[PDB]
C-alpha cells in the first residue's frame, strides 16, 4: 500500500495505489484507498482494509451527524482528531496507518498523518503504507512546496508510481483526489499510462550479465540467449 | 517449615519450628507458626506465611463473629470447614498454605489438616511443611494414643527437632502447645540447637 | 487415579469399595479416608479425586438431595434421578469459570417402591460417572489406576446372581488385585453395600 | 514492557528501649543508570511515632505511601483525633499489601516506630504482608549484607563474651552508619547518602550521612 | 567496567575503572583491568573477565614468542589481528571486549575489538558498561594532538563518568601511557572515592567464638 | 541452581603474615541435608589451602584433578607449588572447560613462606580470578559473607584476631543461609604453623 | 512515532530543557520538524522520550486539567509541582491499568523563585534533580550535566547552563542514532517558559584519526 | 525415588535394605526385584533407579572389580577404592554423550586386613552416592521418597554400637516407616548385611 | 548502514556512510565500510561488522595469493565470485550484505551485489544496507547512467546523504572511492558539509503545528512558544 497527501495553496491532493494483497497474491487490483469522510475531507487508508474501512465508516458517520447538528462545514482538524481518538483507543486491536486530508474554509488545505501509534501530526505532506518508505528520499530530493494544483497532482502521481515500482505490496491504478474550495476532482491513472515504471525506464533495459556463455576469456560479453551461440 | 499435630488420650499436641526461608536465604528464625485463633482453637501456618497468616486471621474473625451471633464457641469441624471453604474458593488463585486446625469443642478434641486446594482431612496425626517428611519418621515410630502429656510433648518436640536438623527450610525455635478440655497451653519454647545438646549430650 | 474405586451390582445388592489413600505428593497423609459418601438411606457414591473437589462435590449433592426431600415432604428420589442430578452438576461445571470437578464417581443405590403406586425400577442400580459428566448404567465399574485390573477380573468372575457372601469374596479379590499390581499403595479399602435394608459398612473386606 | 522496575537502595532499622533509628540510602537507580542521589521517597512519616521504610520499586512505594497516609487520615477522623499505634499501622500494612496479592506492590516495606510501652519496634514485610515485630530489620538490595551483621552485633549468639550493656541511641546510630558504609562499598545499588531518622517519645531527630558517591 | 583509550601526539593513554563485580556485589574494589600485551602494547578488558583474561594472556604469549622469531617489536596490528581472529572463531561466546592501545614504528594505534571480533581503529574509544558515559566525556573534550597531561586528564575524566554514573564501574582510575619508548602504568591515577567514615573496629577478643576441636601443626 | 544444589560456603581472609580459610560443614541436595561433617577445604601444601563450593560432584572431581596436577607438579618440579602458580593453574583448568564448565567456585588462600605476603584468589566457574587484599568468599552464603567480612575485616590483623572475625562472619552468614552451616572448619595458616579449628555453630 | 532524548538542567533563576525536533518511526526519521517541547499552562513545559501518541494524549489530558481548573473556579493556576504531581499520578494510574503512557517525560516549571525540574517514567517512577535526562540523554548527557553541576556547586549561569546543554546535544547528535542536529530549548525563568526557535550545533568530523587511510580495515 | 534404599553402619556390620518394587508407569511388574548387588565377598551396593541403568551400572562396576582382582592376582580392593571407582564412573557419565546413570547408590562394605602389613581401615564402611557422583561416607543414609522419613528415624534411634539383632529391629522400623508413609508401594525390602564373615541375606526383616 | 557502488565509463564509485550502531547507540561514528580487496577492487560491507571484516580479510588474502601466483591483475569477477562462495557457504551463520566493485583492464568498471542469500548479481549500480531501501526510488528518479567520474562521485555522495538523512542506522561521514585505470581517489565528506540533510533543507524549517495555544477559534495559527502568549 502507498498513500500520500501533499498540500498546495488552495487545498490538498491525496494519492494512492490500488492494490490490496493477501501477502503475495493481489486480492483486489482496483481498491479505492481514498475514502470520503465529508464532501472535502478524505482519508487514505493503509493497513488492515477491514480496520480502516470500519474506522473510515464510523468517522464519516460521526462527521455527518456533527455537520448536521452544528449546521456548518466540518474542519479537517475535527476529522483528524476523531480519527486519532479511534486509531488510539484501538491501537492494539487494529493495524491502521491513516492520512486525513482535506479543505475547510478556516484553515484551507490540511494534511494529518495518523500512523499506527495513534499520533496525529499536522504536516505539509504525509506518506503512508508499505510504499511510504520508498518516497521519503524521493520527497527530500524532488518535492518543492508551493506547487500549483496541477503540479501537485502530477507530482503525487509520479510519487505513487515510484513507490509501486519498487514495493511489491503496492501497484495497480494511481487514484488522486484534489480537495479545495472547488468541486473535488478525482482521477485514476491506469498502470499502462503510469508516469514511471521500471519496465519502461531505459536505465533497466540492458539485462544483468548473469548467464554468460562458456568462453576461453574472462571478458564478460553478454548473456547466452541461443544454444547455438 | 515443619509443623506437626497429633491427637492422643491427653488431647492434642501441636509443635512447630520458627524459620521462614525463601529456599536459600533465611528471612526469619522467629516466625510464630501457631496462630491462637480463640482460647480453644489453634491454627498452624505452613507454605506462604502471608497466605496462612491472612486467612487464619480471617478464620479467627469468622470464629469470633460465630461466638457473638450464636453465643457459643464455634466447633473445630465448622472452623476447619470455614477455612477449607476459603482455600477451595481460591483453589486456582495460587494460594500456598498447609494448615492444621486443632481444638477442643463440645465433641472432644478434633484435628483437621486444610490445604490450599480446599482439602480438609480429619485424622489423629499430621505433619505439614518441607520438614514433614522428617518429622513423620520420628513421630510415626514414637506415636501411641496412650502417651502421657509429658511424653507426647517430648515426641512432638523431638519430631520437630529432627526436621529442623535435616530440612534446610526448617529451624529455629521448637514451640509445643497442648490442646485439652480447658483450652490450650503453650507447653515449651526451646531453641533447636539447645535441643541438639539435650538429646545428644556428647 | 491414585485412589481406586470399585463397584458391582448383583440381584439384591450393590457393593462399593474405595481406596482409603489420601496423599500429598508422595506422602500418605492417611491410608483410611472414607471416599464412599451416603447421599440417602439407599444411595451412596464412591467418589475419587483430591479431597477438596471430592468433598465439595459430594456434600453439594448430599445437601441438594436433602433439600429436595425437605421440599418434597420426605419423598426419597430414585437413583436414576440423583445420578442424572449428579451428572448434570459435573457437566455444568466443565463449562464454568471454576473448571470441572476433578472427581470420578460410582453412584450405587437400591430403588425400593416409594408407595403402592410406584411402577418404577425395584432393586440395585449402579452408575459409572466420569469427571466430565459421562453417566452410564453398568453392572460393575471402576475408577483409578486399579480400574482396568479389576474391570477385567470382574468381566471374568462377576455373575448377576452372586450371594452377599460370594460378593465379599469377589470384592476381596478385586481389592487384593489393586494392591498386587498398582504401585500407588491402596492398602485399605472402605467397602459398603446397598441392599433393600439400606447402606451397610462391610468391615470383613478391606 | 514490565509494570515493575527495581529502583534499588537499602533500608535498615534498629530499635532500642526508648527509640528506633530508621535509615535508608538516597540513591534512586533506573535501568543501568542512576536517576537521583537525593531521593528521600524511601522513608515516609505516617505518624509522629511511626514511619514506613520501603524498598524495591519507587512508583509503588509512592502509591503505597499515599494509600497508607489516607487510611491513617481516615482512622484519625473515625477514632476522634486519635492517631493509630505503630502496631495498628503494622497490621494495616500487612492487610493492604495482601489485598494487592494478585498484582502486588513491588515494595519491601518496614514499619518502624514506638509501641504502647515506648519501646522501639520494626515490622519488616515481604511483598504480600507477612511480618513480625523485631528489634531490627533490613530490606532492599543490601539487606542480605546488613541483616547478618545486625544479627552478629545485636544478638551475639555465637559469642562467649558477656553481652555489652544495652546500646544507646548514639551507639545504635554509629552501628547503622557503619553497616551502611559497608553496604555502600559492596552493593552497587546502595550509595550516595543515608537519611537517618531517630524516632523517640520527644520527637523525630533526622540527620543525613555521606556514603561512597560511586 | 568502563575502559577508555585516547591517541595523543606522542602515544596512547589507556584508562580503566577497578571494580570487579559478582552480580550486584563488588568482589574486588581495586582489580587491574589494564593488561600487558607487549612492551609497547597494553589491552584494557571489559565483558566476561575469564575470557578477557584468557584471550589477552593467550595473545600476549603468542606476540612474545613471535618477537623472538622476528627479533622485532610487536606491531599493534599483529596484536589486533590475533584477537580479532580468535574472537571471531568463537562467534562471541568468548565475550572479551578489548581496547588495544600501543605504539609501534607506524605510530600510535588504538582500537576496540568487539566480542564477535569486529575492530574499529579510532583516535578515542570506550568499552564496557560505562562506555557510553565515558564516550560522552571523550566526544565533548577530545581534540587532536593533546599533550600527555591533557590526554591522561581527559581519560581520567572519561573513566570518572563511568565510575559515578555506571553501577558496574567504580573505585579509582588506572591510567596507562604507552609512548614510542616506554609504557607507564599509573594505578590510582585518580582516587575520587577514598574513605567516608573511618572503619569502626568491632573488637572480638580471642576465645569469643566457641571451638569444639583444635589441631595445631608446627613447621 | 546447579551451584546452590549441594550447598556449602567457603571464605578466606588475609591478615599480617597469615590467612584464615573457613568452610561450613553441610552437604545437601537442595533442602535435604545428607551430612553435617563435610568441610570443603583441601590442603595443597604447608602454604596453600583451597575450598571448593558448587556442585559436590564437581567439588570432588575438580579436587581430584587438582590433586593429580599438584602431585605431578611436586614430582616434575621437585618443589611445592606456590599460591600464585596454583591459582593460575586452577584458572587454566576451569577455562579449559569454558563451554561445559565445572560447577565449582574455588577459594584459594596462600602464604609465601619467606616474604610472609598473603595471596587470596576466589575464581568463578570459568576461571576468572578475583585477587583482593582483604578476603574472598563463595557458595550459598556468599552475599551474606561479603557483608560480614566487609564490616569486621581490618588490614593488619594477627592470626587469633583474624580467626575470630572469620568465624563470626562464616557463622553469622551461614545462620541466614538454608544451604550452609552445621558449624565450620577454619584453618589458620601462618609461616610458622597451621592451626585447624572445628567451630560450634547451629544444627539448623 | 517516537521522541528521542530530552535533557534539562537548572541554572541560577530557571531551568533549560532541550530536545531534537524529530519523531522517528523505528529506524526511519519520519518528521524532523516536530515541536516536542510543550508548554503546560503559564509556568511549566514538558517533553517526552517514547510514544509521541501517548505523550500527545497525556499532554492533552494535563493541559486541559490545568486550564479547566483555572477557568471554572476563580483559583490560582496549578504550580509546576502540582501539574507534575497530576502528570505522575496520571501515568502511574495508566501502568496500573496495564495501558501505560509508554514515555519518559521531563518536566520544568517556575512559579516565583521556585524552580521545578523532574522526570517521570512509563511506570510512574518520579525524581526531582538539578539535571534530568530521558532516552540516551540519561546515558550520554547526564554524566556531563552532572559534572557541570559538581564543578559549579553554587549554581550555573544561564550561559554556562546553555554551553553545557549545547555540548550534550552535540554528543547526543554524534552517538544517539535516532537524532537530528536540530534542537529547541525551553527556558523556564520567572516571566514563564520560552521555547527557542530551532537551532543546530557545530559538529567536528575532521579528526586525523577518522581519515580513510587510518579507519581502513585493509 | 519410587524405590527406597536404606543403609546404616554399626561397630561390626553394615545393614542395607532396598525396595523390591520394579514398576512400569503405575503397574507393579514385581514387588521382589533384588536391588542390592554383591560387588565382592565383603562389598555390596543398594542401587536405586530404573532397571536399565541400575543393572548396566552395577554389572560394569562388578565386572571391572572382578577384572581388577584377576590382574591384581586375587587382591580384594578396599571400600574407599571401589566407592571412588564407582563415583568417578558416575561423575564421568554426567559429562558424557550417553548422559548420567540415573542411579542412586548406598555402597556398603567390610574392610578386613588384606595381609599382615595392612595398616588400613578395619571394619564396616558405608558410602552415600548421588547419580551425579556425589560420594560421602555416612553412618547411615537413604535414597528414594522414603529416604527423609528413614533418615530422621535413624537420627533418632541409630547408635554406633547396636547388636546385629537391634539392627534387624531398627531396619524393620525403617522399612515399616517407608510402607506407612510413602504412597509408592514398597511392600517388600531385600535386606542384606556385610560383617567380617561377608554378605549375609537377612530374610527376617522385609 | 548505507553502501552503494555505481559504474561510470572508465570505472566505479563506491560510497558509504560511516556509522556502526549497536541498535540505537552509535558505537563507531567513522567506520570505513569501503574495504580494499586488491589495489583496484573494493567491497562495501553491510550487516555484521565482525562477519564482513572477516570475509573481506579472508577474500583480500586469497586475491593477494592469487595475484602473486598468476603474476597478473585480478578481475573484479574473480573477487565477486570468491566473495559469493564465502557469503553462500556461511549464509546461515553470517549477516553480510556485500557489494564488490572495482576496475580490471579486461572488463573495466564492474559492480556485483552479493546480498544476504549469497546471490551474485552484476549491475550498473548496487545499493546495500538498511539505508538502501531509501535510495531505490532516488535512483529510479534521479540516476542517469553514462555519468562522468566527477558527476558519479557528486551523485553517490548526494545518494548516501539522502539515505542517512532518513535511516537512523546510517549517518556520519560519506566515504567514496573511485576505482578506474588511474590511482584510486578516496575522499571523506564530513556531515557538516554533506550535500543534503533534512536539518538544512528549507522544506523542513517551518515546524508542524502540533502544540497550538488555547484559542476561541478553530483557526490553526502556530505553535505556542511562550507562556505569556
Ligand atoms: O506439607 C504438606 N502440606 C503443605 C500444603 C501446602 C503448602 F504450601 C506446603 C508447603 C509449601 C512450601 N513450603 C516450604 N517451602 C518449600 C520450598 O522452599 C522454601 C520453603 C516449606 N514448607 C512448605 N510447605 C505444605 N503436607 C505434608 C503431608 C501433609 C500435608
JSON list of C-alpha atoms and ligand atoms in Angstrom, two decimals, chain B residues 1-2 19-24 33 46-48 52 95-99 113-117 126-133 136 167 169-170, chain C residues 23-25 27-29, chain F residues 31 178, ligand 1:
[
{"chain": "B", "resi": 1, "resn": "UNK", "atom": "CA", "xyz": [8.66, -25.16, 57.65]},
{"chain": "B", "resi": 2, "resn": "UNK", "atom": "CA", "xyz": [7.94, -28.14, 59.89]},
{"chain": "B", "resi": 19, "resn": "UNK", "atom": "CA", "xyz": [12.02, -20.45, 60.29]},
{"chain": "B", "resi": 20, "resn": "UNK", "atom": "CA", "xyz": [10.70, -18.53, 57.24]},
{"chain": "B", "resi": 21, "resn": "UNK", "atom": "CA", "xyz": [13.06, -19.45, 54.32]},
{"chain": "B", "resi": 22, "resn": "UNK", "atom": "CA", "xyz": [12.72, -18.30, 50.66]},
{"chain": "B", "resi": 23, "resn": "UNK", "atom": "CA", "xyz": [14.52, -21.62, 49.71]},
{"chain": "B", "resi": 24, "resn": "UNK", "atom": "CA", "xyz": [18.09, -20.18, 50.14]},
{"chain": "B", "resi": 33, "resn": "UNK", "atom": "CA", "xyz": [3.71, -20.67, 63.16]},
{"chain": "B", "resi": 46, "resn": "UNK", "atom": "CA", "xyz": [2.89, -23.66, 56.61]},
{"chain": "B", "resi": 47, "resn": "UNK", "atom": "CA", "xyz": [3.63, -22.60, 53.00]},
{"chain": "B", "resi": 48, "resn": "UNK", "atom": "CA", "xyz": [3.04, -18.91, 52.12]},
{"chain": "B", "resi": 52, "resn": "UNK", "atom": "CA", "xyz": [-1.73, -18.55, 56.10]},
{"chain": "B", "resi": 95, "resn": "UNK", "atom": "CA", "xyz": [-2.61, -19.86, 47.44]},
{"chain": "B", "resi": 96, "resn": "UNK", "atom": "CA", "xyz": [0.24, -21.77, 49.18]},
{"chain": "B", "resi": 97, "resn": "UNK", "atom": "CA", "xyz": [-0.97, -22.81, 52.66]},
{"chain": "B", "resi": 98, "resn": "UNK", "atom": "CA", "xyz": [-0.92, -26.14, 54.52]},
{"chain": "B", "resi": 99, "resn": "UNK", "atom": "CA", "xyz": [-2.70, -25.67, 57.81]},
{"chain": "B", "resi": 113, "resn": "UNK", "atom": "CA", "xyz": [-5.48, -30.59, 58.00]},
{"chain": "B", "resi": 114, "resn": "UNK", "atom": "CA", "xyz": [-6.61, -27.88, 55.49]},
{"chain": "B", "resi": 115, "resn": "UNK", "atom": "CA", "xyz": [-4.74, -27.44, 52.14]},
{"chain": "B", "resi": 116, "resn": "UNK", "atom": "CA", "xyz": [-4.55, -24.52, 49.63]},
{"chain": "B", "resi": 117, "resn": "UNK", "atom": "CA", "xyz": [-6.75, -26.69, 47.28]},
{"chain": "B", "resi": 126, "resn": "UNK", "atom": "CA", "xyz": [-0.31, -34.84, 60.77]},
{"chain": "B", "resi": 127, "resn": "UNK", "atom": "CA", "xyz": [2.93, -33.09, 59.93]},
{"chain": "B", "resi": 128, "resn": "UNK", "atom": "CA", "xyz": [2.93, -30.30, 57.33]},
{"chain": "B", "resi": 129, "resn": "UNK", "atom": "CA", "xyz": [5.73, -28.39, 55.57]},
{"chain": "B", "resi": 130, "resn": "UNK", "atom": "CA", "xyz": [9.06, -29.18, 53.84]},
{"chain": "B", "resi": 131, "resn": "UNK", "atom": "CA", "xyz": [10.26, -30.94, 57.04]},
{"chain": "B", "resi": 132, "resn": "UNK", "atom": "CA", "xyz": [7.10, -33.10, 57.42]},
{"chain": "B", "resi": 133, "resn": "UNK", "atom": "CA", "xyz": [8.91, -35.94, 55.59]},
{"chain": "B", "resi": 136, "resn": "UNK", "atom": "CA", "xyz": [6.81, -38.10, 60.32]},
{"chain": "B", "resi": 167, "resn": "UNK", "atom": "CA", "xyz": [15.36, -29.76, 56.49]},
{"chain": "B", "resi": 169, "resn": "UNK", "atom": "CA", "xyz": [13.83, -24.72, 55.19]},
{"chain": "B", "resi": 170, "resn": "UNK", "atom": "CA", "xyz": [13.06, -25.70, 58.83]},
{"chain": "C", "resi": 23, "resn": "UNK", "atom": "CA", "xyz": [-1.84, -38.37, 49.65]},
{"chain": "C", "resi": 24, "resn": "UNK", "atom": "CA", "xyz": [0.22, -35.15, 49.41]},
{"chain": "C", "resi": 25, "resn": "UNK", "atom": "CA", "xyz": [2.72, -35.56, 46.53]},
{"chain": "C", "resi": 27, "resn": "UNK", "atom": "CA", "xyz": [3.42, -38.68, 51.42]},
{"chain": "C", "resi": 28, "resn": "UNK", "atom": "CA", "xyz": [0.47, -40.85, 52.61]},
{"chain": "C", "resi": 29, "resn": "UNK", "atom": "CA", "xyz": [-1.44, -38.37, 54.82]},
{"chain": "F", "resi": 31, "resn": "UNK", "atom": "CA", "xyz": [16.94, -28.62, 51.22]},
{"chain": "F", "resi": 178, "resn": "UNK", "atom": "CA", "xyz": [19.36, -22.55, 54.41]},
{"chain": "J", "resi": 1, "resn": "LIG", "atom": "O1", "xyz": [3.46, -30.23, 53.55]},
{"chain": "J", "resi": 1, "resn": "LIG", "atom": "C1", "xyz": [2.27, -30.50, 53.49]},
{"chain": "J", "resi": 1, "resn": "LIG", "atom": "N1", "xyz": [1.31, -29.61, 53.13]},
{"chain": "J", "resi": 1, "resn": "LIG", "atom": "C2", "xyz": [1.52, -28.31, 52.64]},
{"chain": "J", "resi": 1, "resn": "LIG", "atom": "C3", "xyz": [0.48, -27.71, 51.96]},
{"chain": "J", "resi": 1, "resn": "LIG", "atom": "C4", "xyz": [0.67, -26.50, 51.31]},
{"chain": "J", "resi": 1, "resn": "LIG", "atom": "C5", "xyz": [1.94, -25.96, 51.27]},
{"chain": "J", "resi": 1, "resn": "LIG", "atom": "F1", "xyz": [2.08, -24.74, 50.72]},
{"chain": "J", "resi": 1, "resn": "LIG", "atom": "C6", "xyz": [3.02, -26.56, 51.88]},
{"chain": "J", "resi": 1, "resn": "LIG", "atom": "C7", "xyz": [4.40, -26.06, 51.77]},
{"chain": "J", "resi": 1, "resn": "LIG", "atom": "C8", "xyz": [4.81, -25.18, 50.72]},
{"chain": "J", "resi": 1, "resn": "LIG", "atom": "C9", "xyz": [6.03, -24.64, 50.74]},
{"chain": "J", "resi": 1, "resn": "LIG", "atom": "N2", "xyz": [6.83, -24.89, 51.81]},
{"chain": "J", "resi": 1, "resn": "LIG", "atom": "C10", "xyz": [8.12, -24.54, 52.14]},
{"chain": "J", "resi": 1, "resn": "LIG", "atom": "N3", "xyz": [8.98, -24.05, 51.17]},
{"chain": "J", "resi": 1, "resn": "LIG", "atom": "C11", "xyz": [9.43, -25.14, 50.29]},
{"chain": "J", "resi": 1, "resn": "LIG", "atom": "C12", "xyz": [10.37, -24.63, 49.24]},
{"chain": "J", "resi": 1, "resn": "LIG", "atom": "O2", "xyz": [11.47, -23.95, 49.83]},
{"chain": "J", "resi": 1, "resn": "LIG", "atom": "C13", "xyz": [11.01, -22.83, 50.59]},
{"chain": "J", "resi": 1, "resn": "LIG", "atom": "C14", "xyz": [10.08, -23.25, 51.70]},
{"chain": "J", "resi": 1, "resn": "LIG", "atom": "C15", "xyz": [8.36, -25.03, 53.39]},
{"chain": "J", "resi": 1, "resn": "LIG", "atom": "N4", "xyz": [7.27, -25.73, 53.84]},
{"chain": "J", "resi": 1, "resn": "LIG", "atom": "C16", "xyz": [6.37, -25.66, 52.87]},
{"chain": "J", "resi": 1, "resn": "LIG", "atom": "N5", "xyz": [5.17, -26.27, 52.82]},
{"chain": "J", "resi": 1, "resn": "LIG", "atom": "C17", "xyz": [2.76, -27.68, 52.67]},
{"chain": "J", "resi": 1, "resn": "LIG", "atom": "N6", "xyz": [1.82, -31.72, 53.87]},
{"chain": "J", "resi": 1, "resn": "LIG", "atom": "C18", "xyz": [2.78, -32.80, 54.08]},
{"chain": "J", "resi": 1, "resn": "LIG", "atom": "C19", "xyz": [1.91, -34.01, 54.27]},
{"chain": "J", "resi": 1, "resn": "LIG", "atom": "C20", "xyz": [0.69, -33.46, 54.86]},
{"chain": "J", "resi": 1, "resn": "LIG", "atom": "C21", "xyz": [0.48, -32.18, 54.11]}
]
